[PDB]
Design a protein around this ligand. Structure first.
Ligand SMILES: C[C@@H]1CN(c2ncc(-c3ccc4c(c3)N(Cc3cccnc3C#N)C(C)(C)C4=O)cn2)CCN1C(=O)CO
Lengths: 130, 142, 151
């Protein structure tokens, strides 16, 4: 009855955070809300890096909303992590939001080169209508 | 048919010296189906299982330098009454280049009507609200 | 029950020495809609997608003349074929600089959080485990927890 999606990262599409689906639709790597209502929005991304480079690294993960009404990319949930021997840093985001029919949501990262596809299928993004 | 489920997603006020002030009257912040924000606390409108979550983002310019202890805690106060539900501790400094430490807490809990919920930190001077979506507190009834 | 969804949030016993003992029989720790805590393990009551999460906090006063290794792991045991599989795991070395005696000991803190979404079948036993229970931190409560949320 309630619109739901749980998309995962494409392991084969390296150097990109490309969402793969298996009833909310996935259009242009974005989740499209099919009806007005309260939604649980969630995501996790797992980063890996062999040793620490001299350039100070910042790892960002963000869920953005492109409202049907005022067509502007707005951040709903966001986190920043400075991870600096191989290091491992997960980032997980989630909250409840009122969304209107036609809103496009995007789960994005700044460093796809640091994404860890090793434990992927644990790099996910999803929405659950309440 | 709107969901009648008690839900809340409050966010941090970026104009709060040495404090974390929860804001509901903002774009993409929410109080719904009976949830109340009173004295910086979330008030549960009915008995039930709830998802409780919170995220705080800490930022610090270089390592200056001592026991920089970062705590984030979600506490529960029953209708009679704090009692810690979720908590995390982080030391962002191992040495002495701005650092970033996010703290995300979440779980499922049985709560009774009238319980007050607070999301608190020890170092508000280290908070970061440069961009939106970085500091929040919420509850979702099941 | 307002929901028929299998959920659990168990917490660490601060009195069980040298071990990570999960509790549900405490305030702010629950088992619901079929989830069972049997032999320190969470028992899945039905096939489906579940959020599995665990947080553990380690504390140690000072970094001695050693290289310490901290592990945390979420394991799955399925009825079928008695299939034991590793779901989520983390390894952390809190010491990368040995504190020499002449200099004061500074206490270190290493939190480990594991979480993901997994397909589980009815009767699967899930375990959240650590290698060094002597390094666990009980200064405050709500730091060490294990839980599952059906989707
Ligand atoms: C809301 C409930 C329960 N359901 C539910 N589904 C999925 C997740 C989910 C899945 C993965 C993730 C997830 C949340 N997380 C966020 C989080 C953790 C703990 C407590 N609250 C939150 C929130 N928001 C993180 C980012 C850590 C994660 O990896 C939680 N709950 C299904 C819908 N539902 C119903 O009642 C049905 O009507």
């Amino acid at each position: 009855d309630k619109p739901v999606a749980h998309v995962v990262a494409n392991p084969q599409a390296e150097g990109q955070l490309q969402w793969l689906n298996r009833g909310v639709e996935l259009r242009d790597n974005q989740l499209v809300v099919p009806s007005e209502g309260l939604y649980l929005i969630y995501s996790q991304v797992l980063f890996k890096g062999q040793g620490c480079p001299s350039t100070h690294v910042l790892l960002t993960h963000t869920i953005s909303r492109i409202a049907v009404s005022y067509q502007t990319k707005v951040n709903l949930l966001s986190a920043i992590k400075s991870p600096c021997k191989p290091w491992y840093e997960p980032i997980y985001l989630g909250g409840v939001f009122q969304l209107e029919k036609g809103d496009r949501l995007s789960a994005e990262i700044n460093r796809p080169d640091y994404l860890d596809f090793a434990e992927s299928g644990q790099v996910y993004f999803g929405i659950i209508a309440l």
